[PDB]
């Protein structure tokens, strides 16, 4: 009664007609009103093979979130002056949604790493509301593992492959650029909360690597974009030094709250295509956002050898992985 396939989905949103927010405005064209009564349908006894790492829904969310930016976000200076105005910018949740002749299958397996057979399979006609949060290193307000923690990877042994971890407990980040150096801004994270989780990982990480010590590390090198947790607030790009997050020590004796430095940049590397873009600078006003760390992205050194332990460090930059962190559980399947 069905086979795997790919087709041009459609999006839906609770977007509002006249707010000037860039996400609302994009989706007012592009998307359709949201369904008042969306209906899930648990399926008989059907067992399906999902594969979050080869999912054409990812490639589609990507296309959108790109168009959404290079369009809403106007630089100064041309490309390849342009006048760079200041625009409202908070992402709203976008539902993706099958058209006629296809449906979406959903894995309800609680502990599941978007790969292999599923068994507890549902049928939505529209995914959940996914906010298109573009960021690095950390995955911000979004899904969250219902039961234990989940380590996603296309192949763990190939150190080359990004590792996505799905947190089962959220943790807030309080990032602020106060209302007067203006380019200087910071983030705060309740320390004792965060560490239990990191501890809570490692363990759940150690499980996947033979009870051998799990060591963290700063990133080896590359663009400021990946070396540092990059993200956007109210239109402003933040670059945060996460050396304090992976602070092996604070775990025996230690203390409470954590604080990251973070700088705002106006000359950044595009995530959308190879190049650079200039945006106008901030405004003496206060700029704050507060995200749930719903998960994080790691790489592994391979390296070892093996000594007797594994080294892990921040990664990201391939934004399709952010879309995967949510889309892992859905897949498009045709009927006709």
């Amino acid at each position: 009664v069905w086979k795997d396939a790919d087709t041009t989905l459609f999006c839906a949103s609770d977007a509002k007609a006249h707010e000037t927010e860039v996400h609302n405005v994009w989706a007012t064209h592009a998307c359709v009103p949201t369904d008042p009564n969306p209906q899930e349908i648990h399926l008989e006894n059907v067992t399906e093979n999902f594969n979050m790492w080869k999912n054409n829904m990812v490639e589609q969310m990507q296309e959108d979130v790109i168009s959404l930016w290079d369009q809403s976000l106007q630089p100064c200076v041309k490309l390849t002056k342009q006048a760079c105005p200041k625009i409202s910018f908070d992402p709203i949740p976008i539902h993706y949604c099958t058209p006629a002749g296809y449906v979406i299958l959903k894995c309800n397996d609680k502990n599941f790493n978007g790969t292999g057979p599923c068994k507890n399979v549902s049928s939505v006609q529209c995914t959940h509301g996914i906010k298109p949060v573009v960021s690095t290193q950390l995955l911000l307000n979004g899904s969250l593992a219902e039961e234990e923690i989940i380590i996603r990877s296309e192949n763990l042994t190939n150190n080359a492959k990004t590792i996505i971890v799905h947190l089962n407990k959220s943790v807030e980040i309080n990032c602020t650029r106060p209302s007067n150096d203006i380019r200087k801004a910071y983030c705060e994270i309740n320390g004792t909360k965060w560490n239990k989780v990191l501890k809570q990982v490692t363990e759940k990480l150690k499980e996947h690597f033979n009870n051998k010590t799990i060591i963290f590390q700063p990133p080896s090198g590359g663009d400021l974009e990946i070396t540092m947790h990059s993200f956007n607030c109210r239109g402003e790009f933040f670059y945060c030094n996460t050396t304090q997050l992976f602070n092996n020590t604070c775990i025996k004796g230690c203390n409470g709250t954590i604080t990251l430095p973070c700088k705002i940049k106006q000359i950044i590397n595009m995530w959308q295509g190879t190049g650079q873009a200039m945006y106008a600078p901030p405004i003496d006003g206060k700029i704050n956002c507060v995200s749930n760390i719903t998960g994080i992205l790691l790489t592994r050194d391979g390296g070892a050898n093996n000594t007797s332990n594994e080294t892990f460090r921040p990664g990201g930059g391939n934004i399709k992985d952010n879309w995967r962190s949510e889309l892992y559980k859905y897949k498009v399947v045709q009927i006709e």
Partner: peptide
């Protein structure tokens, strides 16, 4: 991502280069 530049760019430190999306990463 421009890999070869990225490869060259990380080689400065004696790291290898890899594309991480439209960015440059080093190990």
């Amino acid at each position: 991502x421009n890999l070869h530049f990225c490869q060259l760019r990380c080689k400065s430190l004696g790291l290898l280069g890899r594309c991480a999306x439209t960015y440059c990463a080093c190990v």
